[PDB]
């Protein structure tokens, strides 16, 4: 199961 | 006894040749099971192992949605890293991400991972306490401060300790025949004179799973660390792995050398002698 990745540097 | 699940993602910018190419792959232990390629026609998360094909349509829709969102996020992160490092929009750059989890024989959570590399070097990584970050340089310290203020690490813990562990446990059960078996190495040795003074002895390990293995040469019981040629463990292509270790020995003294093979599929470490 992949993760939800939205956070930006 | 313990097991891992990892996702590996690569975004590569291509100035003048479109948006960055994004590729992601999923592994359980040493077995790949999914892939996504942003340049491919399908635009879907795709199966790469027989046992993941049991998952239903809602799985593939949802996993596709997640990996596409990641591709857009790291597309943006490439532009931000470009600005943090004061680099031009002419050059091609690489952003890699790895995330996932380790579970014990128990099945319970052992470790979680969430880390990035920029142009092949560490950028920022989630530490083992899942509360703090390790930043590699001053650019990544910008992200570190922003992510600490926003409690990014805390908001990853449900995935790392919950979804990841649960998904890994389900894959290990559904792919039990594959993922939970141990194939011991089939071993042999070869012998090639290279002069009338010396010969090569090569110790081979073939057909083994998982990939972890140790091959060591001893001479009269003493480890021959700095005289051994050791190749990187390599895939056979059928889901098993190969490795060899070689030493150059004086002709007629082959019998003082022993090759020692350790692997989880061996009840007993092996000693081979020519």
């Amino acid at each position: 199961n992949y993760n939800y990745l939205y956070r930006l540097f | 006894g313990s097991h891992s699940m990892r996702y590996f993602s690569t975004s590569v910018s291509r100035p003048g040749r479109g948006e960055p190419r994004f590729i992601a792959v999923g592994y359980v232990d040493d077995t790949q099971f999914v892939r996504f390629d942003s340049d491919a026609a399908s635009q879907r998360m795709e199966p790469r192992a027989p046992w993941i094909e049991q998952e239903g349509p809602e799985y593939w829709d949802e996993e596709t949605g997640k990996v596409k969102a990641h591709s857009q996020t790291d597309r943006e992160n490439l532009r931000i890293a470009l600005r943090y490092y004061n680099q031009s929009e002419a050059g091609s750059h690489t952003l890699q991400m790895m995330f996932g989890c380790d579970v014990g024989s128990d099945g319970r959570f052992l470790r979680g991972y969430h880390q990035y590399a920029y142009d092949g070097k560490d950028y920022i990584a989630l530490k083992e306490d899942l509360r703090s970050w390790t930043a590699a340089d001053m650019a990544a310290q910008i992200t570190k401060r922003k992510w600490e203020a926003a409690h990014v690490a805390e908001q990853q813990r449900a995935y790392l300790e919950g979804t990841c562990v649960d998904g890994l446990r389900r894959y290990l059960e559904n792919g039990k025949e594959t993922l939970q078996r141990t194939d011991p190495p089939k071993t042999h040795m070869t012998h090639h004179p290279i002069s009338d003074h010396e010969a090569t002895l090569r110790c081979w390990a073939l057909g083994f799973y998982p990939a972890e293995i140790t091959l060591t040469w001893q001479r009269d019981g003493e480890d021959q660390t700095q005289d051994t040629e050791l190749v990187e463990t390599r895939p056979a292509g059928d889901g098993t792995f190969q490795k060899w270790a070689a030493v150059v020995v004086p002709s007629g003294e082959e019998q003082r050398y022993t090759c020692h093979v350790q692997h989880e599929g061996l009840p007993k470490p092996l000693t081979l002698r020519w």
Binding site: - | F8, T10, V12, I23, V25, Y27, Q32, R35, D37, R48, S92, T94, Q96, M98, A117, D119, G120, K121, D122, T190, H192, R202, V231, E232, R234, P235, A236, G237, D238, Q242, W244
Partner: protein
Amino acid sequence: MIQRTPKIQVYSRHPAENGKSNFLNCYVSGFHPSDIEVDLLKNGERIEKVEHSDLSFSKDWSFYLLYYTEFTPTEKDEYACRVNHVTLSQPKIVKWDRDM
């Protein structure tokens, strides 16, 4: 910028026996950046239908790929792997040795 030259291994999936179907592999690992061109050669000529694994990487972030094709070794056919990478001033050509 980090640049690492590929380590190259050319080998068969099973020990070679003339006349017996097999797979020819070229495994490239430890390189950076990921842009790379890998061709399998038969008697100096590029084999046309070569497959490769999906791009992945190791703990140190260096990339690895497996290129492979089905083949049947014969006594007088010579196989090699040609790797083209920015760290290589000319493509590296590694010949298949049935005992590496």
